[PDB]
Write a protein that binds this ligand. Structure first.
Ligand code: NI
Length: 195
């Protein structure tokens, strides 16, 4: 029933490197509780209180429909999404229960911090750089605001949210999100509190 190294990849990883981190729900702010549960319920397509990989993969598959990405780009995105949500606690067999979702998110965040400290690759960056190429339907090597709006549409976010996020991440002022700026955006969208 409770998350640990036997049923959650992020606990598995922390314990493998001696990280003693423990979850305390009192640490999670109300905004983040609100956003996490809303994300769960949006992802939980059948409203059974469980998140499964099949439900998670509906969204990148909708992204694929809205662009014309290469088969290998699409396969990189599929792989990245699978790895990301596995490390977020979505067992490919057991899924993940609503009541463990907040905790699954917070142990994943500690595991990304441990990775950072250890110079190991960020899984958020992996997810962002795989989506990058799929979003870049132009072929121009970058993501422009229309390319980001398409992502909003695939995710049932109103296409006007794109202008906000884009402005905040294009600190370059290039009119494009280069790969570090989409990382920045994905770190917020998929983990960190909004500033
Ligand atoms: Ni940044």
């Amino acid at each position: 029933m409770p998350l640990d190294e036997t049923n959650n990849e992020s606990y598995r990883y922390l314990r493998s490197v001696g990280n003693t981190w423990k979850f305390n729900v009192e640490d999670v702010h109300p905004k983040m509780l609100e956003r996490l549960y809303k994300r769960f319920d949006t992802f939980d397509l059948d409203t059974d209180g469980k998140m499964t990989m099949d439900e998670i993969m509906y969204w990148p598959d909708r992204m694929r429909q809205l662009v014309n990405a290469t088969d290998e780009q699409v396969e990189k995105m599929r792989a990245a999404v699978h790895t990301f949500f596995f490390h977020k606690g979505v067992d490919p067999v057991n899924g993940l229960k609503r009541e463990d979702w907040v905790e699954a998110n917070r142990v994943f965040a500690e595991a990304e911090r441990e990775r950072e400290r250890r110079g190991e690759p960020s899984l958020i960056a992996l997810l962002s750089n795989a989506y990058y190429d799929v979003l870049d339907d132009d072929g121009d090597g970058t993501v422009d605001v229309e390319e980001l709006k398409t992502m909003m549409k695939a995710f049932d976010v109103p296409q006007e949210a794109a202008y906000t996020f884009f402005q905040k991440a294009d600190t370059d002022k290039t009119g494009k999100l280069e790969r570090p700026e989409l990382v920045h955006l994905f770190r917020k969208f998929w983990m960190e509190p909004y500033d």
